[PDB]
Symmetry: D2
Subunit: 509 residues, 4 copies
Amino acid sequence: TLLINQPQYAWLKELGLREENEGVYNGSWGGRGEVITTYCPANNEPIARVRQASVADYEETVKKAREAWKIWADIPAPKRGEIVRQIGDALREKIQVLGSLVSLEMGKILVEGVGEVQEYVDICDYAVGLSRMIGGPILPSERSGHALIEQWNPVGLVGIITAFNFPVAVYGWNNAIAMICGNVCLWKGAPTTSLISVAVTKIIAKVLEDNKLPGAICSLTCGGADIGTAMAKDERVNLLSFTGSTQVGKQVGLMVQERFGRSLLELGGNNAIIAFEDADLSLVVPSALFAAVGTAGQRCTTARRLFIHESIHDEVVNRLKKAYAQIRVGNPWDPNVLYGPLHTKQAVSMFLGAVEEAKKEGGTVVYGGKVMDRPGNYVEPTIVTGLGHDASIAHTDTFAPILYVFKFKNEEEVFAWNNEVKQGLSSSIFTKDLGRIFRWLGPKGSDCGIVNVNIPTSGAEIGGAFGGEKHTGGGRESGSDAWKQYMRRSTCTINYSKDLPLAQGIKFQ
Amino acid sequence: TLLINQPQYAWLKELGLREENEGVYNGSWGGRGEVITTYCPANNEPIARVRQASVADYEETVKKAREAWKIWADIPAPKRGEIVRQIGDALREKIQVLGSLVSLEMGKILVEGVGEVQEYVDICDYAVGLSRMIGGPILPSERSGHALIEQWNPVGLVGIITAFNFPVAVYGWNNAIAMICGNVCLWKGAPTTSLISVAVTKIIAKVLEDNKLPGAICSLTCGGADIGTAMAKDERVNLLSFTGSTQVGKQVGLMVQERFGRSLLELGGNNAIIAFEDADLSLVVPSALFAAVGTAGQRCTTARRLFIHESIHDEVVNRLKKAYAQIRVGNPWDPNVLYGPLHTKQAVSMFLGAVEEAKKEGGTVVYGGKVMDRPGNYVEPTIVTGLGHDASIAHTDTFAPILYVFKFKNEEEVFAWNNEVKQGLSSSIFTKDLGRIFRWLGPKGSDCGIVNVNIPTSGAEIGGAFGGEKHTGGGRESGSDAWKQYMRRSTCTINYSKDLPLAQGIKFQ
Amino acid sequence: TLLINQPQYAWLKELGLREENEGVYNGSWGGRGEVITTYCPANNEPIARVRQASVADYEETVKKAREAWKIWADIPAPKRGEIVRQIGDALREKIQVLGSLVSLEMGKILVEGVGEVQEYVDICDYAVGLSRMIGGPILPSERSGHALIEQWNPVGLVGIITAFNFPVAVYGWNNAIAMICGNVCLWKGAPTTSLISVAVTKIIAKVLEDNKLPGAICSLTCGGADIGTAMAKDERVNLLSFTGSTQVGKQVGLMVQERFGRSLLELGGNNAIIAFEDADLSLVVPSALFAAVGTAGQRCTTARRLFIHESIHDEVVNRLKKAYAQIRVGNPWDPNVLYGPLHTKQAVSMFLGAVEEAKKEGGTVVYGGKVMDRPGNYVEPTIVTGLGHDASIAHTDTFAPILYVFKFKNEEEVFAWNNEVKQGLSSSIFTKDLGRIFRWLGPKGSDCGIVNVNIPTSGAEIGGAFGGEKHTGGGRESGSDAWKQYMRRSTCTINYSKDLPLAQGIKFQ
Amino acid sequence: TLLINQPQYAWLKELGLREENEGVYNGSWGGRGEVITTYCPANNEPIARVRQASVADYEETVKKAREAWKIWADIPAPKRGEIVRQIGDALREKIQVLGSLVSLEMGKILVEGVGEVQEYVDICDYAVGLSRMIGGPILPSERSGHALIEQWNPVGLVGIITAFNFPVAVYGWNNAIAMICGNVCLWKGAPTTSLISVAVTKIIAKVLEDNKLPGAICSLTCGGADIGTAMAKDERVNLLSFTGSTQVGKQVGLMVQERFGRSLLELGGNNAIIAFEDADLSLVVPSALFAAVGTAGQRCTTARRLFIHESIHDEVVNRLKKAYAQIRVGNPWDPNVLYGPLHTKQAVSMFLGAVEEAKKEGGTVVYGGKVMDRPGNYVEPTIVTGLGHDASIAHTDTFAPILYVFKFKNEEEVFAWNNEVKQGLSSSIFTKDLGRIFRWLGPKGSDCGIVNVNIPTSGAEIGGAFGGEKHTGGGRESGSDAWKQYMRRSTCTINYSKDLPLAQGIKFQ
Ligand SMILES: N[C@@H](CCCC(=O)O)C(=O)O
């Protein structure tokens, strides 16, 4: 009855998964907490089982990771980068099968599952180069015979809590960067993507073990909220990177601040696309489509609000309705399928509640709005017109494929409306106007951390820093100098002289 | 009665100070809150009075500041730098008499008062050059016909809360940097340095108004804990920089996190100097003296722990005693005075309590330990030997001139003892050993934000970032790229083509 | 009959100039070579005289500069920045009278003369901040117990050869940057701007003397081609920065290479403005006017080629002709004069030589083309149409105010025509097309070192690097990390361990 | 007769080598010039033959590379990085046989042969990271409504001339960096390592072919000085990176300067190791051994001068003699030998010339000095004592394994003696003295491009820039921001507004 026992899914054994898998890894595999069974959202059938972490499992792992850190921090950064290079190779090798497991356990379509693993391969290549570059400037002291250098050192143990919707990539960004920065990692994933977490940890463990490194360098404790809270409250967790809901993120931030730890919060988005009158509609429509219905609307970067200039509102909406009706729905691993199930049955419930709440706040469902009559967690991608831009349901961020469409007239008001929500992740404008574009990029433009022009709100590349402002939580991951969040800066002055000139010329005599 | 009414203190009026002064500035001067009188700690005489902010003053000042921000953020950064340049020139012209006011109201000696003002002058020079440099990289997009740029924009209103012990420099570090980054500022100082806050703001307000700019760009609301708490709970304060006690800082970080604001925390230090057997003792003794007794021991970077290797412990301690007994006591505005009073009468009593608790816990007062027989808040700088490194009184947070002296034998134990406290601000080793110095700078060395060699724990220059780790709060000010804390990063992708290739080669069609 | 002996030019004495002035400074003033008289191009009247450098003068000056470098190089860079800050202040206080001398001796209008001095002011401000920043990274060594450091140190003596047309600013750019980088300078300006060079040198010398530093840190040796050739051949001149003709620059470049010195060449430009059909003509016409007739067309960044799309060629030409007729011609110090004389009587001949040649090669003079019958070296700013973009007269760059106008159709061809010339200094397109602008910035776009959009080819700001490609010589001055040309990089590996790991894991034992 | 026709050398076929090989590659393989036979320096037996380029081959190859660049420069940099990544992998997979070919045709020992290929692997890893990073800053313009951007674009065709002694790594540093920067490459190796150049080109060709890219992106034209002179005079070669003799490189720099090309010169080095009295002798002796006898003394970074403090001169010289006696001599393809032959018989003649001159000039051969009585180009590694530091023989340009040992007393004279040579590549001091180490890194310290402490002058790691000063020619390769030499910077100002504010506030009205 488990999918891993059925012959058409034997490929799961290529990831080393079996009927019951250990969900704790700290150099040894184990798990004394509750055995969880994860299910395929496309057909509600059980896949395999994972033994989750008890509290003793959590305690032992943290201790072994900190002991592993003593060895790992002594390994030169470029040699750490060589370990991350080998991880990138292992991922490359299994990108198709790991991508298939993402489609199977998470439910996003095969090209997105593969593409998500590509994000991990990309940031590995990136981190490999970064491991020969991380550091600070040597600066010219104002004092003779003094050297002034900025040093960066690992923070220690980096906890990583990831969400259901990107069960490989978010961990991969945090892992590759933290590792070359000399940190050890502790991973707690979404319980409903535990097989993916195990499969990824199996890949990493083999690399560590082949290199005669302690496996606790990349530790895994599968578990629910109790384990996540433990990490948020654990003084031995120097940096807690949390990707999840804003509500839970806020509490993670508070718990970390109470103990004077470090947090990196990557929280919800309420991302807007803005199509001005001069927009290239052949870019607008397919961009709104990918941003709205990509991943069945389940990215933190999904387009949730579409603002269209009055002159083109009807046409864009009609053109978008026709494109929705061509979306090919099916099993997320099937060829030509563009749209899969929602991840959980509760996500279907939430979708239903949001649709009905949108009607109660005066919206009109112009497309979709219904559960699909078929096995699995399938819902229709939905477009809602007629709501005020400040409608309560629109300012709520729901992980459901519902696109709230609004009219506007002037640039100034629509910038204000992009900015008026609590979230602050991604944003896009479609326009040809050179001046408007740079105003969008400037201090009176978009208040988000991702500020795009003529592309979807989703689909970032890894070379830039990824994250948001406001209620999205302020953390950054991946590229640019996001690596600095995973290290502690020291400002270092060395008197190599036989004198003691004081800063600012102070004569203390 | 008031010092400002006596002819010998007529120089206070060179700073625009009067018998009663407005403590609110926002383009207009006002103050409808409680009137406070500040006192000269060298003689316990009243200096002058300041009309603090009421709640209505605070509310109106924030509204004026955010209005001023609309203008100020539209001003090109180099032109904002020119304003800061002129502020630097204004401090330059007033440096002696501003320094003298710092000595009078706060109580540090004159070279420190002038030196503290000089830090503001220095960060002004630095920020002027920065105003032509701030920003992010243009990155190579993996996508044809796409540009990828990292942009930096002001966060908006920067609230700045400062302490009694650096009543000019800390505000200055924040102000110069926040200004060129296109932010407006709201300053709340220590009530017992209100005259200094008012005087500094009078200097800045004139530059702003001379440049026909709205004064609320650098707003001042003098007040106590209510004003600080209001700023911490106020969504209109985009970034709150807080320098103060660890306990209040923890409460400010929690409040700001509750509303998803940005905080920059600079809290207490419990800084150690470590002297190895190969140390040049002629560097040790004067460095210890200044680090411990400078500012009458009232810096967050004051050396409170002195670790001396067993072989040299008695000789360094004897030499410090002779050095201590030679320091010239007197009024702190008097040139060539080296030792002034503590800031308050309460501090004197807390100094006595610490000296008593040090004796209770086993320690021996080898020098000092008693109040001095003279007007004002004078205490003997004090040396306590014989305690264990883990003695309770030594892990405490006090602004009293007591130096706790410990013995050690080996490198590893004394690095660990340095790191064993809760704070993590400054640290220093004295040694000639090449390898030991690089180990101290590395991942197994000092855990502090400031990591010095053969110099005191105090007296940083502005060109590097200033701040600490662990319970020091994590914030950085002044140099390096601390300016990024005053701005929001955006990662910006611009599709300038007629096509829509997706990141990671994802084919969504 | 000297202008400086007339009462209306008494303001010259505010710069310390006299009837006959010393044109050698090395801490002392002197000059034993030939005496030069400079003439005011607006009336051809002699202004004053300058005693130029003999061979003995040059020898003694280089030696004194190199001896002064031993002191200067030991001053911490921020303290060298403080010197540059005072140079900036001295320039601020004399900006009007210095700009007037630029107008009197060089001949550009007063607003530009003042603007040119502002450039030196601006780069002083930049360099002051840079003096806290210059340096390289600390990198992660692949070898345990090794530090890896990029260090930057002065080259030593920077010779600076400047030209007649920017007789303050180019020296200024080189001066501020070289100084904070720890070099000493030796200046040989254009013979026909000798008083300007003396005036600027007097200003810097006072700052150096007021700071008790050897004046030879900023040495002057006024002279002609003999002194410049000596500098290019002199192994004691570590870096030679030459701004001048392509022809001379090539020989300078060869001579420095022959001796394995460092050269920084800023040579001629043949800058094109290209206006596409969708261009804002309200930006096009003023920008073209400023770029063509600014400085009577004697900048290396002056627009000499104007490509206009066929659809708008006639309209842009007509509007530009009407704009050329608005220009007020007069004495360059007279108010609201926008057009002054050419620098030399020789330039007037070449202008007439160029006009006759353009007609012979088939051009039509639609505006100007004649000498203005008045005192001074006044020629009409000229527009020439109907030539092929590949006509010889158009490629030979000369400083005559002659704009060559060309038609185009395709973006591809006209980008190629921008790039087909031997120089590669500045370039500008006028368009609204978002894709066109980013192609112009890209690898199939402009090949020039300055690549502008919707602005003239002249008028750079100091925050960026300044210089060109191809026959423009390759050097960069002023902003970005141009400072690195004035310093030597060293890559430094420090083994502080007891072991000897080899790079690349090479086992040699 | 040909080794490649002997069964024990069949491993050569694993590299695609044959009895007669094609020495031109531009997408297709050919070569119409002279057929060169390369020989094994360990036994003087012929290996295989290579058809070199005629000038028509060169002509056709340049034209093909320039067409390929039009395609290659359009490929996004991260995608170009992916090609280099696969080049890295292809090298990883062939590291043993390619290292053996280097050992066989060049003559260095196998562990260095492999290690040299490892440098190419390492720089591929670095370049892949870079390919996401290269770019310049976005700068805040002083003008409202203006963007200021520093852009980097490829130079076009990078001609790469390499030398016999590093026949793989030097090309690789240039290749990996030039490739990700969007340039195409044209390689001319040393004629006596023609098989190595063919073998590396075969590896890159397969990668290019497998990725459907034109092979001329990495073109090969094997040949001698006529081909090298052609590249130095060819305006189609935008950058010429030349590694070779000082005298040839000077002429290369002159030819390139004559045509306003870009050159990158990496010439000879007369590198010194300085041993102060406090030096750890257990680090000194092996470092001096490896730095002197590594590669049979044929590195440009080889240690030629060994300065030893008077007090330890005799001891280290005797300790270096006992190390020299332990050198294991034999054929270089053994994975266990330490010392192979010189590359050429003429190097033996030169070596014998220098030893005889050192003895004539008063030196004492204390070790070696003789040819080894076996087949091949074997000389004994030699130590020569008793010469002054300015003895003529010690200031020659000879790749001979002769180490010249000098005495010194104080730090100042010996720093000067390090600096007295014409070249400026590498340098190293052995000391524990902290102040001395920072003095050596500073402005009165070593003048070299590579400045090392307690390690060989040789054996750089790729993270930093590589190259020297003075007669070493000034170019930098590999790490840090050396990638900027392979690109052209542009300073780009974009007016996105409707106004025309001028720099420096010049009102042109
Ligand atoms: N690469 C993805 C990451 C989204 C992460 C998330 O939705 O939580 C994107 O840019 O849309």
